[PDB]
Amino acid sequence: WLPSRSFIAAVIAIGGMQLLATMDSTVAIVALPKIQNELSLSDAGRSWVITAYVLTFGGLMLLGGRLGDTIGRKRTFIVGVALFTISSVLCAVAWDEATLVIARLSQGVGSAIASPTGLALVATTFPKGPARNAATAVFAAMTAIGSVMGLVVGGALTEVSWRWAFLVNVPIGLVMIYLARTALRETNKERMKLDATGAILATLACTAAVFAFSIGPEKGWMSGITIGSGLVALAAAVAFVIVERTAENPVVPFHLFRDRNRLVTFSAILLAGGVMFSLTVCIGLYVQDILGYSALRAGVGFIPFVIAMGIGLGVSSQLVSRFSPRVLTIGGGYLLFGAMLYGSFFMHRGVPYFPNLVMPIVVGGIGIGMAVVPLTLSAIAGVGFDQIGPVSAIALMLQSLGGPLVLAVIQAVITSRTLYLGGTTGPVKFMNDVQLAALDHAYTYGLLWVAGAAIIVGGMALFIGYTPQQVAHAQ
Amino acid sequence: WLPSRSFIAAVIAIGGMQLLATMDSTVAIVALPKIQNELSLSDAGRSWVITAYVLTFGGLMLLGGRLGDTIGRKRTFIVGVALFTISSVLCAVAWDEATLVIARLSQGVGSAIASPTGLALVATTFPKGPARNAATAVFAAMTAIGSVMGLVVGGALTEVSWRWAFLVNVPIGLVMIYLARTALRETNKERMKLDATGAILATLACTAAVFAFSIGPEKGWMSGITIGSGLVALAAAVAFVIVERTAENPVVPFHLFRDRNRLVTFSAILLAGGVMFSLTVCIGLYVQDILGYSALRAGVGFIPFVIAMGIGLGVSSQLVSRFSPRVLTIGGGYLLFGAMLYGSFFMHRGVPYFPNLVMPIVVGGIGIGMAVVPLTLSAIAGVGFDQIGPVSAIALMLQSLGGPLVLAVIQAVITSRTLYLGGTTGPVKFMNDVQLAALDHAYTYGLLWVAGAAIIVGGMALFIGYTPQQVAHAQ
Numbered sequence A, B: 001w002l003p004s005r006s007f008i009a010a011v012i013a014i015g016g017m018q019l020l021a022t023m024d025s026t027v028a029i030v031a032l033p034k035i036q037n038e039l040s041l042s043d044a045g046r047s048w049v050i051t052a053y054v055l056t057f058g059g060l061m062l063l064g065g066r067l068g069d070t071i072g073r074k075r076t077f078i079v080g081v082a083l084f085t086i087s088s089v090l091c092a093v094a095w096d097e098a099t100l101v102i103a104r105l106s107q108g109v110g111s112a113i114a115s116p117t118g119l120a121l122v123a124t125t126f127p128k129g130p131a132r133n134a135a136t137a138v139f140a141a142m143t144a145i146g147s148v149m150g151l152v153v154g155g156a157l158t159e160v161s162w163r164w165a166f167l168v169n170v171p172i173g174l175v176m177i178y179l180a181r182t183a184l185r186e187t188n189k190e191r192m193k194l195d196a197t198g199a200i201l202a203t204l205a206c207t208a209a210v211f212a213f214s215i216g217p218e219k220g221w222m223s224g225i226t227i228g229s230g231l232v233a234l235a236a237a238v239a240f241v242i243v244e245r246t247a248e249n250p251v252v253p254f255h256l257f258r259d260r261n262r263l264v265t266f267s268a269i270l271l272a273g274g275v276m277f278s279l280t281v282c283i284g285l286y287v288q289d290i291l292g293y294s295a296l297r298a299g300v301g302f303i304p305f306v307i308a309m310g311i312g313l314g315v316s317s318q319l320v321s322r323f324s325p326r327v328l329t330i331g332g333g334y335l336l337f338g339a340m341l342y343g344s345f346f347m348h349r350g351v352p353y354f355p356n357l358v359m360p361i362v363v364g365g366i367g368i369g370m371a372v373v374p375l376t377l378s379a380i381a382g383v384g385f386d387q388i389g390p391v392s393a394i395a396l397m398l399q400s401l402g403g404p405l406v407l408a409v410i411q412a413v414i415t416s417r418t419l420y421l422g423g424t425t426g427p428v429k430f431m432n433d434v435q436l437a438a439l440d441h442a443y444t445y446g447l448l449w450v451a452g453a454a455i456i457v458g459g460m461a462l463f464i465g466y467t468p469q470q471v472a473h474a475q
C-alpha cells in the first residue's frame, strides 16, 4: 500500500516509452485521413506515413537492444525518448511529405532505441521477485493506458488541425525524461563493447523484411521491388546467422535457446501478441464503421477495457508468486476466449452499449491482463544482467511482429466472407444496409478465426515448463 | 408448473430403458470383482461378463430400431423392457459361467430392442416443440440418475452377495412397464413391413465389429480370431451398404444424409459421447483408486453431478426455443472445458471434497446438461414419422460407440504417461506412494487429452447449421 515514490516514479519512467509509442501510433492512425485532406497527400503517402515509423521501429530495435548494453540502459533510454520527443516536435511543424516522412523515420529510430531498453530496464533495475511483478504490471497497464488515451486524444482533436494531435507527445515525453533522470538508478561503469557487423546485418535484414511486407499490398506482391527486398532480407538474415554463430559478443544469443520451454514461451508471445493486435484492429474498425462510433466515443468506451486490464494485471501479479505461469496464462486465455465467443455470437449492428458491449470487453481485458504478466515474466527469466538486452529485444520483436502477420490473415478472411455474403468493397460511406450487415457477419467470422488462433496460443502455452520458483521468488 | 400426470408418466416410461440399462451396466461394473471371487471365474470370464452384454447391445440395436417401426414402438418397447427384466431375473439366480453369459446376452438383446425405440418414442409421441424439449431433458436427466444411482447401489450392496445387486432391475423394470402400459398412447394401426436382408446384414456387421474390438486386447491384436472377425465385419458392412443402396425400406436411410449439417451433428454426437464416456470412466477410476473412495462414496459424491446436470438440462431445454443449438452446445462445452481445465490443474491426491471436487464436477455437469439437449434435438429433426427409427438408432449407436473408441486412446495415453513417470503397472494395492503420484499425474494428463478432444468437439459443433425454428418451434 502506497509504495516508495522512487519505485513508482521508476516504473512509470520505464514503461513511459511503450506508453508514448503506442499512444503516438494510435493518434497517427486516427489522424491519418486529416493529414491526407489538409496536405493533399496521395495513397502512396498514406502508406508511407506509417511505413516509415514501422520500418525504423522494426529495423533498428535489435541494434537498440544491444546499444543499451554497450552505452548504458538508463542513458540510451534517455537518448531514445529525447529523440522520439524531438521527432514528434518536428512532425508537428511539418509542411510537406518529405519532412513528415523524415520525422516518422526519426520517431521510429527513437522507439527502436528506447523500447527494448525499456523492457531491459523492467528486467534489470528491479531484482527478481515482487518488484519485477509490479514493474511488469505497470508496464502492461500503462501500455494499454497509452493506447486507449491516444485513441481518446485522436477523437477529441479531430476537429482541430492534425498539427495539435502530435504535440501531446511533448509534455509526456519531457515529464517522463525528467522521471527517468531523477528516479532511475544507474549501475556501475561496466562499459561493454558492441559488435558492429552483427548489429548492422540484423538491422539490414529487419529493415528489408519490414519494407518488403509494407510495400507488398501497395506496389504488388510479385513486383520487382518486393521480391528484391525479400531476397535481400533473406540473404542478410542468413549472413547475420552465420556471423552470430562465431560472434564473441552475440547480437542475438543462440546459446540461450537451449531450453525448449524458452522457445515455446517466445513462440507463444509472438502468437499471443498477434492475436491481441488483431483484436485491437478488428474492434476499432468494427466500432468505428459498423456501430458508427466516433474515435472519441471509441476511446471512452475502451476506458472500461483499461480498467478491466488493470484489475487483471494486478491479480496476475499477485498470483504469479503462487501459481505456475502455465496455469495463469491458460486461465486468462479461458476468460478471453469466453469473451470472444460471446462477442462473436450475440452482437450485431444496433446492440446497446452497457449490456452487449461493456461486459465482453471487460471480460476480455481481465483475461488479457491475467495472461500477459506470466508470459513476459517467463520471457525475462534465467538470464544474466549481461544477456538481458538481446532477450528483451527478441521478445518485443516477436510481440510486435506477430500482430500484422496474423492481422493480414484475419483481414483476408473477413474480406473473403464479406464478398461471399455480397458486400461491396470500399469505404463504409457508399455501402447501404445490406453490405453493412454482410460486413458485420464477416467481422463476427473474423472474430471466430481469432478465437481459433487463441485456441492455438493456449495449445502452445500448455508446454510452458517453468515453475514459479524460477520466476517470482527471488533467491 | 406441475404438468399433467400422463405427460410425466410418459416421459419417465420412455426414458426408463436408458435409466435401467445404464444403472444395470454400472452395477455390473461395480460388482464384477465379487462375481470372480464367489463363482471362481477366470479373466476370460471377467471379459465375457461385459462382452456378451455389449455384444448384443451393439449388434441388434439397428434391428431393434427398425423392429420398432415394423411392429409398433410402444409394443416393442414393452417387449424389450420385459426381456431385460426377465434376463436380469435369470442373471440373479445364475450359478455358473454359461447361464450368466446367456443372461447377459439376453440383457443385451433387450437393451438393443428397447433403447433406440426409447429415443424414437421421445421423438414421436410428443410433437415438436416444448413437449419434445421436456422429454429430451427428462431423458438425459434420468439417464444420469440411473448411472449414478446404480453406482450407489453397487457401492451399498458390495457387502452382501452380488446376487442381490442385479435384483434392483426387477422392481424398476416392472413399474416402468406398468407406466408404459397405462400412460403412453398408441398411434394408428399403420403396420409396416421389415426388410430382413438389410437388418440381418447390419446385425452381423455390428456383432462382428463389437466381438473383434472386445477380443482385441485379451486374445491379442493380430491373432487369427480378431483379424477374422474384423474382416467378416468389413465384408458384412460393405454388403449391407450395397443392399441398402437398393432397399425399398432402407434399414439405414442414406437418403437423409443429404444435409451436411446432419452429418456434422451426427459426428459431433459420436465424439461428444466418446468424451463423456471417457470422462465417466476416468473419474470413476481416479476417485476409486487414487483418492481411495468406496463405490458408495463415489455415488454419493456424484449425486451433486446429477443435480448440476438437472439444472443444466432444464436451462438448456428452456433456452433452445430462443438460441441456436450451435450457441448452446458451444456454451455448455465452454463450461465443461473450464471444469476439465480446473480438474487437470488443481487436483492431486489428498485434496478435500467440497473445495476441489464438488465445484469442478458441478460445473462440468451444468455444461454437459446445457450441451446434450441441443445436440440430440438436432439429431431428431427434419424427419418423418416413418423415418425416425433408423435415425434414432444411428444417433444412439454413435453415442454409445464413440465412448470405448476414444476411451482406448485415453487409457493408452494414461498408461504411457504413468510408465514414463516410473509407475508400476497393475492393481493399485501393490504400488506404493511414488507410483500412486505417477498415476495421479498420468490421470491429469489424460484429462488434458480429453480436454483437447472436447476442443475438437466444439470445432465440429461450430458447423451445426440448424436454426431453432426447425428445432423447437413446432409449426
Ligand SMILES: CC(C)C[C@H]1[C@H](C(=O)Nc2ccc(-c3ncccn3)c(Br)n2)C1(C)C
Binding pocket: A272, A273, A275, A276, A329, A330, A331, A332, A333, A334, A335, A336, A337, A367, A368, A369, A371, A372, A375, A454, A455, A456, A457, A458, A459, A461, A462, B452, B455
Ligand atoms: C487447449 C487450450 C488450453 C486452448 C486455450 C485457449 C486460449 O485462449 N489460450 C490463450 C492464452 C493466453 C492468451 C493471451 N496471451 C497474452 C495476452 C493476451 N492473451 C491467448 Br490470446 N490465448 C484456451 C481454451 C484457454
Ligand SMILES: CC(C)C[C@H]1[C@H](C(=O)Nc2ccc(-c3ncccn3)c(Br)n2)C1(C)C
Binding pocket: A452, A455, B272, B273, B275, B276, B329, B330, B331, B332, B333, B334, B335, B336, B337, B367, B368, B369, B371, B372, B375, B454, B455, B456, B457, B458, B459, B461, B462
Ligand atoms: C473452437 C471451440 C468452439 C472449442 C469448443 C470446446 C468444447 O468444449 N466443445 C464441446 C461442446 C459440447 C460438448 C458436449 N456435448 C455433449 C455432451 C457433453 N458435452 C463437448 Br464434450 N465439447 C470449446 C472451447 C467450447
